[PDB]
Design a protein around this nucleic acid. Structure first.
Ligand SMILES: [Mg+2]
Length: 134
DNA sequence: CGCGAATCGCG
DNA sequence: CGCGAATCGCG
């Protein structure tokens, strides 16, 4: 399997797990930042990776793009394909925002179709995913 | 730490 | 038993 350069790559920047979560989607070839989510005060890295893929799906659908999405998160890929984010993070006032976003992302997946292939980025083969926060 | 996958205890 | 609940490997 080889890299598809004409694609979008996503990744999360965490400050702790759980902790502050941000993410972005970038052009795999050029590194152009296509979308970003500002820091969410608490969430898990998995939740952020799930949100990043769904945001990518929404972005690509709006643009009618057929580009695939790369994620380095096998867990988040599974959650998206299952249309169910199996997170164990407690639901309280503190975690209300991340859960609101996850619930809405699930709702989007359950009420839309999409053409975008969702592919696993192979870090051991290909090095850092282009959206890495470093 | 949080995950999915793989590996006890009570009814 | 056998079955859900509770407890390695990675990133
Ligand atoms: Mg990540």
């Amino acid at each position: 399997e080889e890299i598809i350069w004409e694609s979008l790559s996503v990744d999360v920047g965490s400050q702790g797990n759980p902790g502050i979560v941000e993410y972005k989607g970038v052009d795999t070839k050029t590194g152009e930042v296509l979308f970003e989510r500002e820091p969410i005060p608490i969430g898990t890295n998995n939740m952020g990776e799930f949100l990043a893929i769904v945001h990518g799906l929404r972005y690509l659908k709006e643009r009618n793009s057929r580009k695939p999405i790369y994620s380095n998160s096998q867990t988040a890929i599974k959650w998206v394909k299952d249309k169910k984010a199996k997170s164990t993070l407690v639901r309280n006032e503190e975690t209300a925002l991340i859960w609101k976003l996850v619930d809405e992302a699930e709702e989007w997946l359950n009420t839309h179709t999409y053409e975008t292939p969702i592919l696993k980025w192979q870090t051991d083969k290909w090095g850092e995913i282009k959206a890495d926060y470093g």
